[PDB]
Write a protein that binds this ligand. Structure first.
Ligand SMILES: *[C@@H]1O[C@H](CO[C@@H]2O[C@@H](C)[C@@H](O)[C@@H](O)[C@@H]2O)[C@@H](O[C@@H]2O[C@H](CO)[C@@H](O[C@@H]3O[C@H](CO[C@H]4O[C@H](CO)[C@@H](O)[C@H](O)[C@@H]4O[C@@H]4O[C@H](CO)[C@@H](O[C@@H]5O[C@H](CO)[C@H](O)[C@H](O)[C@H]5O)[C@H](O)[C@H]4NC(C)=O)[C@@H](O)[C@H](O[C@H]4O[C@H](CO)[C@@H](O)[C@H](O)[C@@H]4O)[C@@H]3O)[C@H](O)[C@H]2NC(C)=O)[C@H](O)[C@H]1NC(C)=O
Ligand SMILES: *[C@@H]1O[C@H](CO)[C@@H](O[C@@H]2O[C@H](CO)[C@@H](O[C@@H]3O[C@H](CO[C@H]4O[C@H](CO)[C@@H](O)[C@H](O)[C@@H]4O[C@@H]4O[C@H](CO)[C@@H](O)[C@H](O)[C@H]4NC(C)=O)[C@@H](O)[C@H](O[C@H]4O[C@H](CO)[C@@H](O)[C@H](O)[C@@H]4O)[C@@H]3O)[C@H](O)[C@H]2NC(C)=O)[C@H](O)[C@H]1NC(C)=O
Lengths: 208, 207
C-alpha cells in the first residue's frame, strides 16, 4: 500500500523567531482507484486542526502524491514536543502513523573558530577560508558566511562528525578570490544553534 | 539459497607496496544438505588460480560461511581491472557472479594544507590542529596524523565532501594538549591517494 514520510522544520526556521518552521507529511503511491486521503495531526497527543493540505499531484509513475503542512511554534519544537501525522486511505487496512520531534540530548554550546588560508595556498588564484564549529550537541545547526553584511555563498560545509568526547564538530569552507583576501576584506562565519545565547553567534576573519 | 558478497581491498592497501590488497568473496547461508562450494575467479574475463580459500565454518544459525580471498596486484587494481567471483553450489539453479573494480573517473591530485589553532582557542586546555585536503578525485583516500615517529590517537576526519567543481575535500582535526603545542612539538598530516606522486605526501605544523 501507500507510504508516509514525515519531515522536520529546517534548523534555521526553528532558531530565528521571525521565520516560519513547518512539519511536512508526505504520502506517496496513492492510487488513482482510491485517491481519497485524510490527515489527522497531533501535538503531544492532542489533535490540532490548523494543518493545510495541498491537492493531489499525479506522478510520472502513475501514482498520486499528497502533502499536508503543519505550522509549528518555535518554542514547542525546541521544548521537545512530539508531532504525529496520521494518514487514512481506503487502501490501508489501518492508518499509518509517523511521529517526529527534535533530536534529543543535553545541549552543548558550539565553539566557533575561524582559520585563515595556509601560506602554502597563497600561490593559488583562490583561497580557502575555514570555520571550525566544535563541541556542540545535538547536531541540528546552521552555518553561513557573509561579508560587508551580504551572503557569501561559495561554500561547502561538512556533515557533523562525532568527536571523541561525544559532542559534534564540522568545518565550513568558503572559497574566495585571492585578491579579496589580500585586499583586507572582512569575512564572517555565522552559526545558529539552540545552545547559543540568542541562538546566534558570528566570528570574523581577515588579513592583518 | 546461499548469498554472495564481494568486498574490495582497502584503499591504503592498494597504494603502499609494503601492504597486501585483497578482494574477498564471502558466501553465506550454505546448507548442510548441499555444503559444497566452488569458487572461480576472473580478472578482466581471464581465469586466475592463486586464490586462497578457507574451509567452511559453521555459524550459530547452523549454516556455513565460506570465504575465498584473491590477492590483487596493486597496479592491476589501480589500472581499473575487473575482478569477478563465480560461486557454484548444488542448491543453486545457476551460479552467482559478482564483479568489483576501483571507482571510475579522471583522477585529481589532492592539495594538502595544515592550519594552526585559532588564537581564540589558545585559552583552552586542548587545541585543534587542522589538515585541509582538497581538490581530489576519486574520494578513496587515507589521512593520518603523527608526531615524533608515532601515530597520534585523538583525531577525527570528516567524510569526503563533493566540492562545486566536482572534486572532493575533507578536513582532519587533531586534538592535543595545549602544553605540547606550546612546547614546540611538530605534528604531521600524511595523505595517501592514487593521484599523488608516489601515492603519498606529508605536511607539518608547529608553533
Ligand atoms: C513513484 O514516485 C514517487 C515520487 O516520484 C519520484 O521521486 C523522486 C524523488 C525521484 O526518485 C523520481 O523517481 C520521482 O520524481 C516515489 O516516492 C518516493 O518513495 C521513496 C520510497 O520508496 C521515498 O524514499 C524515502 O526518502 C526519504 C527522503 O525523502 C526526502 O529526500 C528525497 C531525496 O533526497 C526527496 O526526493 C524527497 O522529496 C524528500 O525530500 C524532503 O521533502 C521535504 C518535504 O517537503 C522537504 O521539505 C522541507 O522540510 C521541512 C518540512 O517540515 C521544512 O519545514 C521545509 O519547509 C520543507 O521545504 C525537504 O526539504 C526534502 N529534503 C531533501 C533532503 O530533499 C528517506 O528518508 C527514506 O529513507 C528512510 O526510510 C526508509 C524506509 O523506512 C529507510 O529504508 C531508510 O533507511 C530511511 O530510514 C526513503 O528512502 C522518496 O522520498 C519518495 N519521493 C518523493 C518525492 O516523495 C514512489 O516511491 C514511486 N513509486 C513507485 C512504486 O515507484
Ligand atoms: C547466519 O549467520 C551469518 C553470519 O552471522 C549471517 O551472515 C550475514 O548475512 C548478511 C546477509 O543476509 C550479510 O549482510 C551483508 O553485509 C554487508 C556488509 O558486510 C560487512 O559488514 C558487516 C557489518 O559490519 C560484517 O558483519 C560482515 O562480516 C562484512 O564485514 C566486512 O567483511 C569484509 C570481508 O572479510 C572485510 O573486507 C570488511 O573490512 C568487513 N567490514 C567491516 C565493517 O567489518 C552489506 O554491505 C550487505 O549489503 C547488501 O544489502 C544492502 C541492502 O541495502 C545493499 O544496499 C548492498 O549493496 C548489498 O547488496 C549485506 O547487508 C552479513 O555480512 C553476513 N555476515 C557475515 C559475517 O558474513 C547470515 O545471514 C545468517 N543466516 C540466516 C538465515 O539467519
Amino acid at each position: 500500500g501507500p507510504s508516509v514520510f514525515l519531515f522536520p522544520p529546517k534548523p534555521k526556521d526553528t532558531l530565528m523567531i521571525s521565520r516560519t518552521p513547518e512539519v511536512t507529511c508526505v504520502v506517496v503511491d496513492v492510487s488513482h482507484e482510491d485517491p481519497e486521503v485524510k490527515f489527522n495531526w497531533y501535538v503531544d497527543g492532542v489533535e490540532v486542526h490548523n494543518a493545510k493540505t495541498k491537492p493531489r499531484e499525479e506522478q510520472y509513475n502513475s501514482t498520486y502524491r499528497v502533502v499536508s503542512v503543519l505550522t509549528v511554534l518555535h518554542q514547542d519544537w525546541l521544548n521537545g514536543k512530539e508531532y504525529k501525522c496520521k494518514v487514512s486511505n481506503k487502501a490501508l487496512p489501518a492508518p499509518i502513523e509517523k511521529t517526529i520531534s527534535k533530536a534529543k540530548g543535553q545541549p552543548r554550546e558550539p565553539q566557533v573558530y575561524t582559520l585563515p588560508p595556509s601560506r602554502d595556498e597563497l600561490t593559488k588564484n583562490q583561497v580557502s577560508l575555514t570555520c571550525l564549529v566544535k563541541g556542540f550537541y545535538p547536531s541540528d545547526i546552521a552555518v553561513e558566511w557573509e561579508s560587508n553584511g551580504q551572503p557569501e555563498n561559495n561554500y561547502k560545509t561538512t556533515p557533523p562528525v562525532l568527536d571523541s568526547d561525544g559532542s559534534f564538530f564540522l568545518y565550513s569552507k568558503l572559497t574566495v578570490d585571492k585578491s579579496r583576501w589580500q585586499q583586507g576584506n572582512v569575512f564572517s562565519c555565522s552559526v545558529m544553534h539552540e545552545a547559543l545565547h540568542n541562538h546566534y553567534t558570528q566570528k570574523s576573519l581577515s588579513l592583518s
